[PDB]
């Protein structure tokens, strides 16, 4: 769709307009637009991909364009004077919002609008927009600010359509499967009619799906129906409870209630699981609203956690830190207003609160100018209340009925700020920050927030508790530094620094205390070195600086073996011994074939960790360096990419069928297989295939060193070391993915093509049972490919029970609330398991890009801990060996093993889309 939008309006065809429309349908901004109006926007709209900090226009300028936000958010700034640096930020708009319609009557811009993050916009020019307004004026009244549109959308009672059906479907399911749940019940001399019991509804919901993982989560989903009037407490309680309390469904209020028909039961079978997925998405916010209705002081510990978890998904709060957000839950106010036109606050009043829109829309009004812009769900306003004692700079008028707000008061937010500062300890040199610490509630434990490498090291050393009983808690504390040091303090600095600390002199204390210091300091440095050696581990210590330090450090500690040497016996083990799949080491020499144009072999013998500069040198061993264009990564689609000279261990960074080169045309072999399976894997046992897949997947998984996750995230070149093991384990996800796509597309007959889907679903099931979530996800993704989803006739013939299996598997792939479905699923499983690795990589990549490693000359150690948290999660997943659980691989399944480990595949989407169309025409 970006391709279409880049093109000129007059040049894009009718099918070009079709696919941008398919994109802009789901786009939150246009979800209220008329279909015909939208197509005209598609026809004449321009695309804009802007950076952070770009001002589109200033207050007073001549407007040229109207805008609609597709990605990101922007600030609205207004000055009361004629000087731009008196401009206060009054609001922020994002995904749901459009702006700039003042160009319709040549009105000078009301405000200055600047991006606050990387943003994507659609824009329409003034003449296209004026013309558009003339033709579709009737459909634009609610969308545009007055005088161009109307002030209030209420234009002067809702049981939601989808919740009403949701409640209806679930009730059919209950009556069919567990009729005992809906009956007349009696308690305390009173008889209550056709009703349910709270706990039993929670019991039922848990057993009837795989997407509900706690009694708490189930309460949130039932609240969706109770909030909307669809499920009603037998008295008038406003909230659903996991208790012995009675509740009655809506169409059970009728006394003359008829039995569900055969046609009604049929559609319940089709919709139930899909209804469950909807409620699981709607549940968390309905639960937050329920809790927030209780005043601050009456919120339990569990209450706070329910609020907090949802707050992390509200974009307007994301800029705030973890400590602040954790405190916010206890203070946050929920607020609902019934009628549009309600004035929330007036310009010139005391700015007491900041607001965030959970539901509805508002008009921002400045006296003397009118409606400056309109805000929608997700947007925020009244920000100045948390900056100054200045009065309100604008007025807020409700644009529609039934608006919900999140509210933050000035007294509370300021109390929260100084409480966390009073909990912050700052060490200073020349009155400049050098170490920042927060206290740990739960001898005084601290958490390292930020500091210089030297003070961070100094801190972690002093914290080392030597008491042998506190053995692993001491090791646990040191792990973040030891695992992450390479980023902020590479061995170049750490190793000399450790030497100085070992030979350091006491600067404080009694004469007797200063005599003792040298001992306790020396053996604290030793403790760190041991764990530091245990991090890099055996056969990764092949760092020159690191080995040199250790040799001399052995001499130093030997010199004074006079007091305690009980841990000195642990040092020559790491000195003498330094100075299935096997893990690729980087020093390992590898024979690699390189190609020139007209496809010619060049077998080279280099270490894995060799640089691109080191590659060229061995290529020119044929004599004749510096000729033509050298070294390019070759995609199977033809997409050529050149790599820089300081790149390391490139060989495993290729696409599945990619080749390394030195116009450019790919090898004919890079197009993969031409014919399908023919018996083989599809006549093998699904459980056997999955077992052999999982066996293999562990071998690669256990080859991956924990520091490889660190190198990959922070850039491979910056450490000059390999990630070969991780690279091959990551490739396997795509290999399995494309393997499903390849074989399905290569199957010519429909009868046999349906049998493949059946088999791939079966293998995915057994993968999940073995706790191989990686390969499970890889299959499900390949099964979700456009070239496979398109085959409607294939899915049509697929038996109903396998359709239910795949529906359940898809729901687990739900990206909703940062892959919540997956997170809750993975956490309840025990250590022997393989995670959805692409997500773990993406987790670390997101944290790296969203936070600065150096915050103006100080290390962001809070950032370091967050990356290390995901890495430590891998260690937990590998902390137990994979059990075949007997009765399986008894030296006979060599055929299944051989197939699994030697997958030949098509990684070219175009080829696979063509093939998909030739099987089942559009």
Swiss-Prot record:
Residues 444-579 form the N-terminal Ras-GEF domain. One of its GO terms (cellular component) is hippocampal mossy fiber to CA3 synapse. Interacts with RAP1B, RIMS1 and RIMS2. Probably part of a complex with RIMS2 and GTP-activated RAB3A. It is found in: Cytoplasm; Membrane. Its main location: cytoplasm. The keyword Cell membrane does not apply. InterPro entries: cNMP-bd_dom (IPR000595), cNMP-bd_dom_sf (IPR018490), DEP_dom (IPR000591), Ras-like_GEF (IPR008937), Ras-like_Gua-exchang_fac_N (IPR000651), Ras_G-nucl-exch_fac_CS (IPR019804), Ras_GEF_dom_sf (IPR023578), RASGEF_cat_dom (IPR001895). Guanine nucleotide exchange factor (GEF) for RAP1A, RAP1B and RAP2A small GTPases that is activated by binding cAMP. Seems not to activate RAB3A. Involved in cAMP-dependent, PKA-independent exocytosis through interaction with RIMS2. GO terms for biological process: adenylate cyclase-activating G protein-coupled receptor signaling pathway; adenylate cyclase-modulating G protein-coupled receptor signaling pathway; calcium-ion regulated exocytosis; hormone secretion; insulin secretion; positive regulation of insulin secretion; regulation of exocytosis; regulation of synaptic vesicle cycle. 3',5'-cyclic AMP binds at residues 382-385, 392-393. Residues 176-251 form the DEP domain. GO terms for molecular function: cAMP binding; guanyl-nucleotide exchange factor activity; protein-macromolecule adaptor activity; small GTPase binding. The keyword Ion transport does not apply. Keywords: cAMP, cAMP-binding, Cytoplasm, Exocytosis, Guanine-nucleotide releasing factor, Membrane, Nucleotide-binding, Repeat. Expressed in cerebellum, pituitary, adrenal gland and liver. It comes from the Eukaryota. Residues 685-922 form the Ras-GEF domain. This is Rap guanine nucleotide exchange factor 4. Pfam families: cNMP_binding (PF00027), DEP (PF00610), RasGEF (PF00617), RasGEF_N (PF00618). Disulfide bonds: none annotated. The N-terminal nucleotide phosphate binding region cAMP 1 has a much lower affinity for cAMP as compared to cAMP 2. The DEP domain is involved in membrane localization independent from regulation by cAMP.
């Amino acid at each position: 769709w970006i391709a279409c939008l880049d093109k000129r309006p007059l040049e894009r065809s009718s099918e070009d307009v079709d696919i941008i429309f398919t994109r802009l349908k789901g786009v939150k901004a246009f979800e209220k637009f008329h279909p015909n109006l939208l197509r005209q926007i598609c026809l004449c709209g321009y695309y804009e991909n802007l950076e952070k900090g770009i001002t589109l226009f200033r207050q007073g300028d001549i407007g040229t364009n109207w805008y609609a936000v597709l990605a990101g958010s922007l600030d609205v700034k207004v000055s009361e004077t004629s000087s731009h640096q008196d401009a206060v930020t009054i609001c922020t708009l994002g995904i749901g919002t459009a702006f700039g319609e003042s160009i319709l009557d040549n009105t000078p811009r009301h405000a200055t609008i600047v991006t606050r993050e990387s943003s994507e916009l659609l824009r329409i020019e003034q003449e296209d927009f004026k013309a558009l307004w003339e033709k579709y004026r009737q459909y634009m009244a609610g969308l545009l600010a007055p005088p161009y549109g109307v002030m209030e959308t209420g234009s002067n009672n809702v049981p939601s359509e989808k919740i009403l059906r949701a409640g209806k479907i679930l009730r059919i399911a209950i009556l069919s499967r567990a009729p005992h749940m809906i009956r007349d019940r009696k308690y305390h001399l009173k008889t209550y009619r056709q009703c349910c019991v709270g706990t039993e509804l929670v019991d039922w919901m848990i057993q009837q799906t795989s997407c509900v993982h706690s009694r708490t989560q189930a309460v949130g989903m039932w609240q969706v129906l109770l909030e909307d009037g669809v499920l009603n407490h037998v008295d008038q309680e406003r909230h659903f409870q996991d208790k012995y309390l009675f509740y009655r469904f809506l169409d059970d209020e009728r006394e003359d209630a008829p039995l569900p028909t055969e046609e009604e039961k049929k559609e319940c079978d089709e919709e139930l699981q899909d209804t469950m997925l909807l409620l699981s998405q709607m549940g968390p916010d309905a639960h937050m609203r329920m809790i927030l209705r209780k005043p601050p002081g009456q919120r339990t510990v569990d209450d706070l956690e329910i609020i907090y978890d949802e707050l992390l998904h509200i974009k307007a709060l994301s800029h705030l830190s973890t400590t602040v957000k954790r405190e916010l839950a206890g203070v946050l106010i929920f607020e609902s207003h019934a009628k549009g036109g309600t004035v929330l606050f007036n310009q010139g009043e005391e700015g007491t609160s900041w607001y965030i829109i959970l539901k509805g829309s508002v008009n921002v009004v400045i006296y003397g100018k009118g409606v400056v812009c309109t805000l929608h769900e997700g947007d925020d306003f009244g920000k100045l209340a948390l900056v100054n004692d200045a009065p309100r700079a604008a007025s807020i008028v409700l644009r529609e009925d039934n608006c919900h707000f999140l509210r933050v008061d000035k007294e509370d937010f300021n109390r929260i700020l100084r409480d966390v500062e009073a909990n912050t300890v700052r060490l200073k040199e020349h009155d400049q920050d050098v170490l920042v610490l927060e206290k740990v509630p739960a001898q005084q434990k601290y958490t390292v927030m930020s500091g210089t490498p030297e003070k961070i090291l100094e801190h972690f050393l002093e914290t080392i508790r030597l008491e042998p009983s506190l053995n692993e808690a001491t090791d646990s504390v040191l792990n973040d530094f030891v695992m992450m040091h390479c980023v902020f303090m590479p061995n170049t600095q750490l190793c000399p620094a450790l030497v100085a600390h070992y030979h350091a002199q006491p600067s404080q204390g009694t004469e007797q205390e200063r005599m003792d210091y040298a001992l306790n300091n020396k053996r604290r440095v030793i403790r760190l070195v041991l764990q530091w050696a245990a991090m890099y581990g055996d056969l990764l210590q092949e760092d020159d600086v690191a080995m040199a330090f250790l040799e001399e450090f052995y001499v130093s500690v030997s010199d004074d073996a006079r007091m305690m040497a009980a841990f000195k016996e642990q040092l020559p083990e790491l000195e003498k011994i330094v100075k299935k799949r096997q893990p690729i080491r980087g020093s390992d020499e590898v024979l690699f074939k390189v190609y020139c144009i007209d496809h010619t072999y060049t077998t080279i013998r280099v270490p894995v960790a060799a640089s691109v500069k080191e590659v060229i040198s061995a290529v020119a061993d044929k004599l004749g360096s510096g000729e033509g264009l050298i070294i390019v990564k070759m995609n199977s689609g033809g997409e050529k990419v050149v790599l820089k000279s300081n790149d390391v261990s490139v060989f495993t960074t290729l696409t599945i069928n990619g080749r390394l080169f030195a116009s450019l045309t790919p090898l004919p072999e890079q197009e993969g297989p031409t014919t399908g399976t023919v018996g083989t894997f599809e006549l093998m046992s699904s459980k056997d295939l999955a077992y052999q897949m999982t066996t293999y997947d562990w071998e690669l998984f256990n080859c991956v060193h924990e520091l490889e996750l660190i190198y990959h995230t922070f850039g491979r070149h910056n450490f000059k070391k390999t990630t070969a093991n991780l690279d091959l384990f990551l490739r396997r996800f795509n290999e399995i993915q494309f393997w499903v796509v390849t074989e399905v597309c290569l199957c010519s007959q429909l009868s046999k093509r349906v049998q493949l889907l059946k088999k791939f679903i079966k293998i995915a099931a057994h993968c999940k049972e073995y706790k191989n979530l990686n390969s499970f996800f890889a299959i499900v993704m390949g099964l979700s490919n456009v070239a496979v989803s398109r085959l409607a006739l294939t899915w049509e013939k697929l038996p109903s029970k396998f359709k239910k299996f795949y529906a359940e598997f898809e729901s687990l792939m739900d990206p909703s609330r940062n892959h919540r479905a997956y997170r809750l699923t993975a956490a309840k499983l025990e250590p022997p398991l393989i995670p959805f690795m692409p997500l773990l990589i993406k987790d670390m990549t997101f944290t790296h890009e969203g936070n600065k490693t150096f915050i103006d000359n100080l290390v962001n150690f809070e950032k370091m801990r967050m990356i290390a948290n995901t890495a430590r999660t891998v260690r937990y997943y590998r902390s137990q060996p994979f059990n075949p659980d007997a009765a399986q691989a008894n030296k006979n399944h060599q055929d299944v093993r051989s197939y699994v480990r030697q997958l030949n595949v098509i990684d070219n989407q175009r080829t696979l889309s063509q093939m998909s169309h030739r099987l089942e025409p559009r």
